[PDB]
């Protein structure tokens, strides 16, 4: 009747099943409400910095904008990578190798930040995997206890299997309660991290664009007067 | 039943396979995880392949970063006198992606077995159960009873088989997923190392060609 009451009326293995299911549910809720607001603040800061850097016309102008972005400003880290590829290429003549190395490093940093986003999503995938499994174990355990109760008695009816059917389908039910929102949270996290990596690709693309502009203008200044 | 006990022992054997794979793969993950992170932290300030070798002189023989630098030094030494350096870069990138994919493949072993065990296990436990249900319905159809009390132990000891199949199936799935993710992060870090090696070769070949441009 009550969930604490039918917890009392259940077998201790079914009790262990249910407490594992509800702990997995609680940590699923916790991972969701953590990563949602953290990712939302990251997206807000990224959209802010992209709206700032949309008006930079040279890379040093972008550094002048980015001098006050903050510590973990990932766009400022992209500009740090671009400045690193400026400083390591001092004494060279190929701008195309600069662009290749820099585009390669920035695609790698996009992939690295996108993998840094995904901390805890495989916990959700494992939860969505094994959520029916322990509940089905408690389900089969409860039906086995139903037949144990029939065997211990000398008669039979539906009244012996009814608390066992209750335990069994209730364990199946809490398995589904652990299963479905874990899937949904994994859906939205995968989608929004994909869109985040896309927006990061937009920002790093703009970084490559600015460096391409300054390399082309430096080559135009050096080639013809 | 003897067939029921045979599939019990089959579930036990697949479970022991899961135990052993978890043990061996986990002890190789815990050892060869952090060392490449430390070596990448060391090689973050290499700035040239010769200074990268000067950093890498104490990495050891089993350092896979040192193996990638062996591949890079091999492509330097085999291509001495080559005017085309972009072809050297292409062949070296081909060898490095081959080597990194080979390391990912050679440490990806033991996992398809886990996927198959975590798939199959509750199903063969289910057939062990439904063979217990064979013995139960044989008792029903031979004793002509409308009574479930004289036939319930067969179905209970039957459902024991599906229970043990679930017991075998769960850690296979869990360990398989977490080891797949650890292999993914390992391949990411190794690709970072090989990418840095390609950056080293690109920098040194570009600066050598620029030094050979004007004396």
């Amino acid at each position: 009747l009550s969930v604490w009451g039918m917890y009392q009326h259940a077998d201790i293995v079914v009790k262990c099943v249910m407490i594992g299911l509800i702990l997995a549910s609680v940590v699923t809720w916790a991972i969701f409400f953590s990563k949602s607001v953290e990712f939302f603040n990251q997206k807000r800061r990224l959209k802010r910095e992209q709206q700032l850097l949309a008006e930079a016309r040279s890379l040093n102008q972008a550094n002048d904008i980015a001098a006050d972005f903050g510590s973990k400003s990932l766009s400022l880290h992209l500009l740090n990578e671009a400045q690193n590829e400026l400083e390591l290429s001092e004494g060279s003549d190929d701008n195309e190798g600069i662009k290749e190395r820099t585009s390669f490093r920035l695609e790698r940093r996009v992939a690295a930040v996108g993998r840094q986003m995904g901390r805890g999503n495989g916990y959700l995938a494992t939860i969505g995997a094994i959520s029916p499994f322990v509940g089905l174990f408690g389900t089969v355990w409860g039906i086995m206890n139903s037949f144990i109760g029939i065997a211990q008695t000398q008669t039979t009816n539906l009244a012996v299997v009814a608390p066992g059917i209750a335990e069994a389908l209730l364990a199946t039910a809490i398995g589904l309660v652990a299963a479905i929102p874990a899937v949904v949270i994994y859906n939205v996290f995968a989608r929004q991290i994909g869109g985040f990596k896309a927006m990061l690709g937009d920002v790093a693309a703009q970084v490559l664009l600015l460096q391409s502009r300054d390399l082309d203008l430096e080559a135009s200044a050096a080639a013809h007067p | 039943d003897i067939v029921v006990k045979c599939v019990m022992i089959g579930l036990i054997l697949a479970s022991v396979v899961t135990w052993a794979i978890f043990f061996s793969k986990s002890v190789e993950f815990f050892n060869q995880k952090r060392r490449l992170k430390r070596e990448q932290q060391l090689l973050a300030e290499a700035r040239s392949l010769n200074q990268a070798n000067d950093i890498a002189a104490d990495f050891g023989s089993k350092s896979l970063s040192l193996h990638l630098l062996n591949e890079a030094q091999n492509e330097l030494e085999l291509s001495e006198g080559s005017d085309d350096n972009e072809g050297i870069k292409e062949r070296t990138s081909f060898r490095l992606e081959r080597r990194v994919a080979a390391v990912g493949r050679q440490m990806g072993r033991g996992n398809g077995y886990l996927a198959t065990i975590g798939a199959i296990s509750p199903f063969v436990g289910l057939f062990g159960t439904v063979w217990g249900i064979m013995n139960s319905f044989i008792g029903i159809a031979q004793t002509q009873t409308t009574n479930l009390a004289v036939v319930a132990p067969g179905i209970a000891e039957a459902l024991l088989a599906t229970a043990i199949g679930l017991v075998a199936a769960i850690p296979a799935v869990v360990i398989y997923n977490v080891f797949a993710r650890q292999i993914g992060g390992f391949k990411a870090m190794l690709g970072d190392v090989a990418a840095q090696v390609l950056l080293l070769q690109s920098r040194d070949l570009d600066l050598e060609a620029s030094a050979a441009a004007h004396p």
């Binding site: 995997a129 029916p132 089905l136 039906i143 899937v183 995968a190 | 199903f123 289910l126």
Partner: peptide, 22 residues
Amino acid sequence: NVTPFIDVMLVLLIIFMVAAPL
């Protein structure tokens, strides 16, 4: 997408449910 891996699980729920009315 890492989402369609639920199908084998669906099959497993179903072929549980074949046995339960029996």
